[PDB]
Amino acid sequence: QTSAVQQKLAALEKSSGGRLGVALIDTADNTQVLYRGDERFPMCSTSKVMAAAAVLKQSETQKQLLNQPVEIKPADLVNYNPIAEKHVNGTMTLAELSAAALQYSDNTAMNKLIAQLGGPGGVTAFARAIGDETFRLDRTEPTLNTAIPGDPRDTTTPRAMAQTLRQLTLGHALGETQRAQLVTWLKGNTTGAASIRAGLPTSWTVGDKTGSGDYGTTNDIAVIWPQGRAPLVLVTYFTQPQQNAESRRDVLASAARIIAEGL
Numbered sequence: 001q002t003s004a005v006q007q008k009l010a011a012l013e014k015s016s017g018g019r020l021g022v023a024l025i026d027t028a029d030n031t032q033v034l035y036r037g038d039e040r041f042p043m044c045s046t047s048k049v050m051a052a053a054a055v056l057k058q059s060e061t062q063k064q065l066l067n068q069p070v071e072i073k074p075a076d077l078v079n080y081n082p083i084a085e086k087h088v089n090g091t092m093t094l095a096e097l098s099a100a101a102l103q104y105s106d107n108t109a110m111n112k113l114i115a116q117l118g119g120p121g122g123v124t125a126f127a128r129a130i131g132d133e134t135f136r137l138d139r140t141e142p143t144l145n146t147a148i149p150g151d152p153r154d155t156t157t158p159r160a161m162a163q164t165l166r167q168l169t170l171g172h173a174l175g176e177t178q179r180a181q182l183v184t185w186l187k188g189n190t191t192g193a194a195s196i197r198a199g200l201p202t203s204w205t206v207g208d209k210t211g212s213g214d215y216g217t218t219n220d221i222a223v224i225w226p227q228g229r230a231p232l233v234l235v236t237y238f239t240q241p242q243q244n245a246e247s248r249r250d251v252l253a254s255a256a257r258i259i260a261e262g263l
């Protein structure tokens with residue numbers, strides 16, 4: 001069946017020039033709204049949530065892991081590294097790398113998380129261990145953002161990512177202190193005000209992780225605490241036909257607004 005909310009999302013998509021994927025979980029009743037919910041989309045930097053969560057999981061059996069120093073060398077810098085470049089020829093702890101990856105979208109920090117997990121397949125292995133059979137990470141930064149249409153590498157579906165984000169932030173995939181740390185990091189994101197947040201009432205509290213890539217790929221995944229309501233989990237993925245297409249964060253805001261008006 002096609003719901004009123006799904007028809008509004010289809011109209012938004014038709015006027016956007018691209019392909020839109022949405023998954024909402026409303027934890028008030030566990031109901032879900034999906035739009036292209038089982039189609040694959042390139043995750044881009046939204047995958048940084050899975051990598052940070054995997055390191056948090058490791059830290060449950062290594063109390064000092066998040067304080068372990070990691071060498072940052074000049075060769076480790078990639079294309080966008082606003083935090084890591086200040087520490088070249090020095091060190092950052094895994095907590096510092098996680099915070100930089102999540103809150104500033106630092107790509108060198110992401111690569112250190114991936115290396116701590118043994119490579120992209122270690123992030124995928126963590127996803128499988130928490131019940132996500134869909135997520136796949138295949139490459140490091142920056143090439144995981146190529147976002148080529150039809151390419152399965154570094155993709156997931158909106159339904160899978162929403163379920164996983166719920167388990168990580170509101171469920172019990174992580175220990176309680178680790179879940180709280182992940183939520184704190186997401187709530188402190190610096191990059192998200194133009195994306196899902198821009199479509200929601202301003203009184204609501206949001207933690208989110210954005211992503212952007214080639215093909216105008218514009219993504220956001222969020223946990224939302226509405227005024228007077230149980231939390232929502234919302235994934236909005238968007239990608240366009242031309243490699244050099246511009247970012248469209250307004251499309252993600254519009255999708256979130258449609259979702260919020262449909263509650």
Ligand SMILES: O=C(N[C@@H]1C[C@H](c2nnn[nH]2)c2ccccc21)c1cccc(F)c1
Binds near residue numbers: 079080211
């Ligand atoms: O790594 C890339 N962009 C990051 C992704 C990161 C961000 N965007 N939205 N959330 N995080 C960000 C922020 C500022 C500047 C660059 C970047 C990329 C994109 C296309 C092609 C490519 F080979 C790499």
